[model samples]
Target: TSVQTSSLIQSLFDFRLAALRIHQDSTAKNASLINALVSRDSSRLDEFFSSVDELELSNAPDLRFISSHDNILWDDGNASFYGIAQQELNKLIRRVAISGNWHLVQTPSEGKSVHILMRRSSLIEAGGQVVGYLYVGIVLNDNFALLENIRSGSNSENLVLAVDTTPLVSTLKGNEPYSLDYVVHSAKDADSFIVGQTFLEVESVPTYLCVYSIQTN
Candidate 1:
């Protein structure tokens, strides 16, 4: 059955909303179900990709959305998506940098990669101190599920986790488990941050991190 774009968008929106509500309501099972459905649906995938492309191509400044816990997230099998997203983020950072409202930091050698960090002045007035910060990272390693997710337009098999190796987000879109470096390297420069390397055995596959960095502003 062919899927309509409008319907697909609406469905995705509804799914996200429900997931949020379920999470807040402590209904993990329900939330999982919604996430699972969206991850498997190709129509929803098309809507998401199309929307993101339009948003970026339109040169929309300050475009950000929270995919998992209020963070901008994107996953495409091709490396081109990473480059494109990085460019957009750099543009945003440059604007803030020019205004003297933000600063950048590089990761230590132990961390690996040129992890870019952004430090922005807080807009809220509380305790006369910077209230918050923004952190960003890009993974440039062999994440098989990520690659396949982008290739097949399905999140059902893809999984994104946190530094602690906890499953934070699972797209459930693909089956292949591509090995990644234990520590993600900086995408910008090698000397920018401390580099570290490690590996993990999950689902009977070796996964490691090749490139990962944090940007705070």
Candidate 2:
């Protein structure tokens, strides 16, 4: 049944490596956009929410909504955010932008639609005083091209995804989606023999959350 065991393991290794490169490439683009915000037009509030819906990308992360320290500011399609209190807003800042480092995080949306956001924030200062903060995000959800690119490049039929043990989306959708859940082994393990028919390759973003696939074809 497993005719290409060695090849499958090696392919999974290469597949995951490519995924990281793709992720790095997107994060680099976001770094540039963020730099522009701080160094160029720092007061463009209209851009915060406007880009999420209108901007499109063929190979990169799509620009979504942005927010400020106090209010929603602008969001492409986040309705619940409008009613969110200041406490939650502060928490988000602490969670994603506290370290002054860019983070790729999966955020809760209105429903099952989890949008992966590459988020970064800059503290606005005036005359040696701290004023507020600016938050930006680029959407990584609903981008079929990314999934397709990874799938075709890896030549894998079963692309499993999950938040650790809870499944989220798959490269191939079916009724038994929840059955795709898995335990994320150490990254050092790389390939784990969990699936009955294929070896699993696990990758985590934002920590704790997981994405994975197998060579079930």
Candidate 3:
């Protein structure tokens, strides 16, 4: 792997870590709102749930208020939010409730498919009672800004988002589409050419990150 490729992978890692923290902070800042959600306090309930209206942006993570009983009390109602299987959702909630934070990768639809990075945080009441939880996520497919924020120089850098061995999005910045398909076909072998790799998950399913230089094309 080239040094540039290694740097790009680090950049992706930094981006992912920073993005996750932003949502983690959001969950922490919403503790009061989460309390209102679980108690069904009408006064602040609208204020809490209505924030969903703000989630229309592609980069914004969907907000969900999940009950202690594993019920969804309120949510931004983003399709990606519900895209997770119930069993997986339950597992995520259980893990987050104990650990405070967790994340999953999801592909919400076929045809118009996009990869998403979903995350969750636990909500605890004033007296230490576990309330519900806060769930948020951002789409990783064709997410220009997702890569834009990670770009270090003016030169175009190639990135590939894949689920397991299958390559998904290619941020190559040109009309000519290349490498993505080749990588898909030879994903296991593609590893040799890949400069860097990082793994994200939607349960056991892994989202792999690969960085390539222009010469590779």
Q: Over all chains combined, what TM-score does candidate 3 have?
A: 0.63
Report how far residue 118 has shifted in candidate 2, in Å.
Answer: 3.2
Itemize residue pairs with steric clashes in candidate 2.
Answer: none
The best candidate by lDDT is 3
Candidate ranking under lDDT, highest first, comes to: 3, 2, 1
Candidate 3 lDDT over 144-164, as tens digits, reads: 565555544424455555565
TM per candidate comes to: 0.19, 0.47, 0.63
Clashes of each: 42, 0, 2
Candidate 1: RMSD to truth: 20.2
Better of 1 and 2 by TM-score: 2
lDDT of 2 by residue, 185-212 (tens): 3231233332322333323322433445
lDDT of 2: 0.43
lDDT of model 3, residue 124: 64
User: All candidates' lDDT scores?
Assistant: 0.30, 0.43, 0.52
Q: Residue 137 lDDT in model 2?
A: 43
